[PDB]
RNA sequence: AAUAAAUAGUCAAUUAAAGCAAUACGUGGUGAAGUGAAACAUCUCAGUAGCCACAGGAAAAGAAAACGAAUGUGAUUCCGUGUGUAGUGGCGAGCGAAAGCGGAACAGGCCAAACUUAUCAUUAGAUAGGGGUUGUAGGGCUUGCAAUGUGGACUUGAAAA
RNA sequence: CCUGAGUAGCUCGGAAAACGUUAUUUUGAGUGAAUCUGCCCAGACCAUUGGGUAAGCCUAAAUACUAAUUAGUGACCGAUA
RNA sequence: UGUCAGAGCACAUUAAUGUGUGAUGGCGUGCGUUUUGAAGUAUGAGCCGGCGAGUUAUGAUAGCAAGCGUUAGUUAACCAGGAGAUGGGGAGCUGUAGCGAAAGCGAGUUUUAAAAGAGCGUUUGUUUGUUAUUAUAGACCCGAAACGGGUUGAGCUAGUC
RNA sequence: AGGGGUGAAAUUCCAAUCGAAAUCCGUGAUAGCUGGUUCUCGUCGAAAUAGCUUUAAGGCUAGCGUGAGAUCACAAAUAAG
RNA sequence: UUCUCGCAGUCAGACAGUGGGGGAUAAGCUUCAUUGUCAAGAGGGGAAGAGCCCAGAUCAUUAAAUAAGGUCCCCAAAAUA
RNA sequence: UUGUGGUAGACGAGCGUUGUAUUGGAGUUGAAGUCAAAGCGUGAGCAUUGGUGGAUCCAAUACAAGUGAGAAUGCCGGCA
RNA sequence: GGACUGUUUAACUAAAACACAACUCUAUGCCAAACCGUAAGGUGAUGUAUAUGGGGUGACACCUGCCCAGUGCUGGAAGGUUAAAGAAGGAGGUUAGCGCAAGCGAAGCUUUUAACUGAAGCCCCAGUGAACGGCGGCCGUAACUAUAACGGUCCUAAGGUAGCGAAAUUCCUAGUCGGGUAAAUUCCGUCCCGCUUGAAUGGUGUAACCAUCUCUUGACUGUCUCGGCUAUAGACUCGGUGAAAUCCAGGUACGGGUGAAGACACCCGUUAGGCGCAACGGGACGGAAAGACCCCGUGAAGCUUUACUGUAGCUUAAUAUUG
RNA sequence: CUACCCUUGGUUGUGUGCUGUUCUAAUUGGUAACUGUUAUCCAGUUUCAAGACAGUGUUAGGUGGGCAGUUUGACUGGGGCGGUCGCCUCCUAAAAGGUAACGGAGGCGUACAAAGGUACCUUCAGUACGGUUGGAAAUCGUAUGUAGAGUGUAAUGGUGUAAGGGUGCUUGACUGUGAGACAUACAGGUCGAACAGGUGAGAAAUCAGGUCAUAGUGAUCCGGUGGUCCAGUAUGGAAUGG
């Protein structure tokens, strides 16, 4: 099996197996979002349980 | 969509630190507000930047 | 022969080539499409199938104008790992090494040019020999010492297993 | 004194390499160098440092395969196999 | 078109409230498929016998079990050995320290002027055997109209000579 | 002589076949579509819903099932206030 | 019926009562909310009926009491006023 | 004591076929096959006897599968 | 309707379709245009504008009207825009060097940009219809009514001319009228608001011809009123050989109802001794063909175009052969 | 008088191409002749005709269904046609929330340097009466009136000492964050206490992380711009990235 080249470059793993990710809606069209929204989307997050199983076998 | 947004940049480090809205048709004069600057860590004049 | 010479052409003698197959391996030229991307054109399929040419008992490759970042390795080939890593991708489907390390085997040789010899209406810029084969540069020019060996990818024979 | 020239480079279209063309390799068209204080390379490029000697040739072994000859084997088949 | 009761008839056994037939009474619209719903005026099979569809190779995850264990665990290629178990082979792979895009720091680290706050960490291993699922391969079996590449056909027929 | 031929032209004819022969090969093409998938017993036992989908006969996640483990009460059910 | 992990199937539903939308207070119509059954559930009543009523089949018994429903005959079971 | 309708599906426990490895055993005084019968099991299934048959087969514990046919307008053979 | 004789879908369409003699347009000066191939080579043609290729129409007779706006084709002065390529220069990277730093900075190479030159084509200007094609409305108006010769106005490139017309064309429409008949959605002639006829995708006539279409009529007849008879070969019976599709197992009634909504099989009734033979087709949603119609599939194939992306060919320029 | 820099013209002179001639030796010929050769091809030698043209190779424009590979959506009381596809408000929606139909009505893809923030002051529309232009209705005074007024907007909800109107000062329409919740398949969305920095209003308490609230919006990839305490393929830069 080959690791998907798109699964990597977008999902980093951690010590306990959580898959770190970046928030979307942070590429353009900045004036259409509030500074609260922008500063909340700047921080990183983890995949939800609904996607953890699908990303585990993808990596 | 229409583009009524404008950028406000500091006048000491010449850094752009704010994104606001402006009506070019109604308001003809450039904005000259005074806002907080992350670099200078103080309040300083921010002017409209193209 | 045209056309004087000379070539084209014609004839004779000698030596090789033709072809086949092993439903298999090698090299080179040419080279798709079904399919996947849940459509499709970049892409994939795939340099695969097929077509053709040349072999050989294997073929191909091969002795650094190299790897590559070090007080480093020192032809080519094949196996494991490095790793599904660095990367490359309408960054989509996908594709995917080169170093290094551990192993199988191990082998390095030879021409051109200089310089020189002999001969060609010697206009040689040509033929046949000696000299040379490189990188911590080599060789030639002139002048000496030490050498008669060790080893080959090497010919004929004889003997033995 | 000699050390491989329409050659290495460069431009225009392609390709090989994992790479969808790009440092390295190759070429259809055009142009075109230098000679150990020389030339090429270390992913655009320049300088320092270092590595290597292109444009000539040959090369056993480990590697790939079994139509065939001899011996033999099979938790392979036993006439719809 | 059978089943539960049931006379009469004829026999005698894997000795068993026995076996063969069944006047008569009660009840009773097949089997698979696909559908909300099939006795089906939907579908598939005339009958019998044989054959006929979840595999293999390489990896990932999880359950169960065994070996070895806290500076652990385990070898791949290859060599010897019976086409062996195995011995040599520690190249490597997983775990042992994490955080950050990265230089970097380190039981801390990223963000930030911040040590405040927040995110991630401040521990529970490895190699095999078996089972389940999954990825690449044709991947449970059968079925297209098609597409591309090569060859064979003008003895029928159409044209021309 | 077949992404070709021939056609006083009809999509005619090209070996009882022609909107583009016959045969072999890529090939076991692909099919979200039909059909089929073979021994037994025991425990438990659904859904036909929401969102997205060039999606509507398909797919992913959530909802409902099953196996293992944890949570004993503060968790979840049945009645009264 | 909450939390974690492994494996799913399901995305065509149907009817009856109740409250509505579309239709015409038509449809065994179509689209919702809710209570039930069928789907995936036999038995008894409805003469015959997937969805209505009574209920939930472990096997055997030629035992007894009952639910819906019924007691002239078919067909088990009644009499008084 | 509470239970035991059941499709898709999940989980658990078993039967049967062929062969191999270890043990033991039967067989021309008759093995497999094959037919019949009034047997034993909760189920796959398992025996006993007799006829035919003429040379291999059985039991236990493990292991490996081309391992289970009623349907595919399924293929082949035979017969209605 | 086609001029004709002919040709055509082997195996459902022989015709009004194709072809044909004839007309016209266009290209072609010969190594001709066109065509097969990749090229050689070849057809055209051992021909030479009275010749060859292609488009359209289809004897013969009379005619073929208007529009060059759009598209196509041909030609054109200059002018504007435009590729490759060449090219004056410009901007950076590096560092010899200058400078306390900072910074500046020669040549060499190297990255990139570039005025300007640069054909055809396009924009633009004319011609071209037997080239692709197109060729209108509204309002008022004459001394009975009716209608409008006539006048006004909008738009277009120009608004359909002749001829023919309820047509193989007419929706309304079985249009009105006349003829044919006792009676005529068909037929013949005529009328014209021709929704939407019309002049080389030709218009209108036309003698002869047609296994063409359509209507009336004489003779003629079993086409019919209306059915009947005869003879053979079958069918039927006997002797011999001996299939076929179909088929879950069958011992296979009718009426009303029910049910997946049209029952041999279910519920309630009625009828019916067992089994053949000859008949005829009501049913078994009878048999044969995994519906050709409809829909679905991110199915296939053929064809079309100013759908997209490409490409053979044709044409223009730079460069090499190239003075 | 001696020098440098602009507009324009002539001159001997070189450097480039641009159209225009002439020439032949490259090259071409399906002109003719001879020879190989008993030979229509081919080759050689001429002759004639062209001629640096043409043809051919490479590069680059134009035309090009002649040819090829594909695309040409979904919902739908069957399809085609018509209509719609995202977000917001009300009803259907059955007094928590949620709930469909090609059911019934409407809007949005913004606006405001003030319509934001703060401090202070202040409170309808309409109607009645009285008054030049002036009129049914402009403005003034008094009274009445409990929202029919305003709150930028489509509706709903809210709000009459408010969230409506006016004035003064300002830019919090801040920086780094963020415990805890709402709603959700995911992706995303919504509210937010509180902390640190530095500000605005106000005497202070306090308020200010855009508006009375709900529509005013688009993921990823790719490339561009500004800043930068990161990388810079031997080293120093640069290129190129983060
Ligand atoms: Mg393809
Ligand atoms: Mg595809
Ligand atoms: Mg697909
Ligand atoms: Mg060799
Ligand atoms: Mg180079
Ligand atoms: Mg490649
Ligand atoms: Mg050197
Ligand atoms: Mg470098
Ligand atoms: Mg050299
Ligand atoms: Mg055989
Ligand atoms: Mg046989
Ligand atoms: Mg009975
Ligand atoms: Mg019955
Ligand atoms: Mg079955
Ligand atoms: Mg059905
Ligand atoms: Mg149905
Ligand atoms: Mg029936
Ligand atoms: Mg049917
Ligand atoms: Mg079917
Ligand atoms: Mg059948
Ligand atoms: Mg069978
Ligand atoms: Mg395991
Ligand atoms: Mg070992
Ligand atoms: Mg912390
Ligand atoms: Mg362990
Ligand atoms: Mg013939
Ligand atoms: Mg094709
Ligand atoms: Mg046709
Ligand atoms: Mg035929
Ligand atoms: Mg198949
Ligand atoms: Mg498909
Ligand atoms: Mg149960
Ligand atoms: Mg349900
Ligand atoms: Mg529901
Ligand atoms: Mg589907
Ligand atoms: Mg699910
Ligand atoms: Mg429903
Ligand atoms: Mg529904
Ligand atoms: Mg209802
Ligand atoms: Mg209603
Ligand atoms: Mg209703
Ligand atoms: Mg219904
Ligand atoms: Mg079902
Ligand atoms: Mg029932
Ligand atoms: Mg009943
Ligand atoms: Mg029970
Ligand atoms: Mg009782
Ligand atoms: Mg009772
Ligand atoms: Mg009784
Ligand atoms: Mg059960
Ligand atoms: Mg056995
Ligand atoms: Mg026996
Ligand atoms: Mg089998
Ligand atoms: Mg005719
Ligand atoms: Mg004729
Ligand atoms: Mg015919
Ligand atoms: Mg005929
Ligand atoms: Mg030619
Ligand atoms: Mg000729
Ligand atoms: Mg004609
Ligand atoms: Mg005509
Ligand atoms: Mg005309
Ligand atoms: Mg004109
Ligand atoms: Mg022109
Ligand atoms: Mg007229
Ligand atoms: Mg007339
Ligand atoms: Mg007529
Ligand atoms: Mg009449
Ligand atoms: Mg008629
Ligand atoms: Mg008439
Ligand atoms: Mg016409
Ligand atoms: Mg015409
Ligand atoms: Mg006429
Ligand atoms: Mg005829
Ligand atoms: Mg007879
Ligand atoms: Mg007979
Ligand atoms: Mg009924
Ligand atoms: Mg069908
Ligand atoms: Mg398609
Ligand atoms: Mg396709
Ligand atoms: Mg040219
Ligand atoms: Mg010739
Ligand atoms: Mg030329
Ligand atoms: Mg071109
Ligand atoms: Mg095109
Ligand atoms: Mg096409
Ligand atoms: Mg394709
Ligand atoms: Mg549709
Ligand atoms: Mg419809
Ligand atoms: Mg309908
Ligand atoms: Mg539409
Ligand atoms: Mg509510
Ligand atoms: Mg409610
Ligand atoms: Mg409002
Ligand atoms: Mg204010
Ligand atoms: Mg306000
Ligand atoms: Mg892109
Ligand atoms: Mg560097
Ligand atoms: Zn600043």
- If one counts the domains in chain A, the total is 1
Give me the count of residues in chain A.
59
**Are B20 and B5 contacting, i.e. CB atoms less than 8 angstroms apart?**
yes
Q: Which domain holds residue A47?
A: 1-59
- If one counts the domains in chain B, the total is 1
Alpha helices in chain A (DSSP H): 35-42, 49-56
Q: Which domain holds residue B45?
A: 1-50
Which chain B residues are closer than 8 Å to A30 by Cβ?
Answer: 19
Experimental method: cryo-EM
Resolution in A: 2.9
Say whether B19 sits in a helix, a strand or coil: strand
Select from B38, B37, B39 the least CA-distant residue to B47. Answer: B37
Q: Could you tell me if A31 lies within 8 Å of chain B, comparing CB atoms?
A: yes
Which chain A residues are closer than 8 Å to B22 by Cβ?
Answer: none
- Output the CA angle A39-A42-A29, nearest 5 degrees: 80
Other C-beta atoms lying within 10 Å of the C-beta of residue A3: 9
Tell me which residues have their CB within 5 A of the ion that is ligand 99: B 10, 12-13, 37, 39-40
Q: How far is CA A35 from CA A8, A12, B34, B41, in A?
A: 30, 27, 18, 19
Q: Is the CB of A49 under 7 A from strand F?
A: yes
Please return the burial class of B1, using the count of CB atoms within 10 Å of its CB with bins 0-12, 13-18 and 19+. Answer: exposed
């Amino acid at each position: 099996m080959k690791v998907k080249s798109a699964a990597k470059k977008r999902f980093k793993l951690t010590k306990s197996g959580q898959i770190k990710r970046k928030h979307a809606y942070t590429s353009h069209l900045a004036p259409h979002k509030t500074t609260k929204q922008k500063r909340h989307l700047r921080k990183q997050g983890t995949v939800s349980a609904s996607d953890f199983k699908r990303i585990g076998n993808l990596i | 969509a229409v583009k009524r947004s404008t950028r406000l940049g500091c006048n000491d480090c010449r850094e752009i630190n704010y994104l606001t809205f402006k009506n070019v048709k109604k308001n003809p004069e450039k904005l000259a507000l005074n806002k907080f600057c992350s670099r200078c860590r103080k309040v300083v004049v921010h002017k409209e930047v193209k």
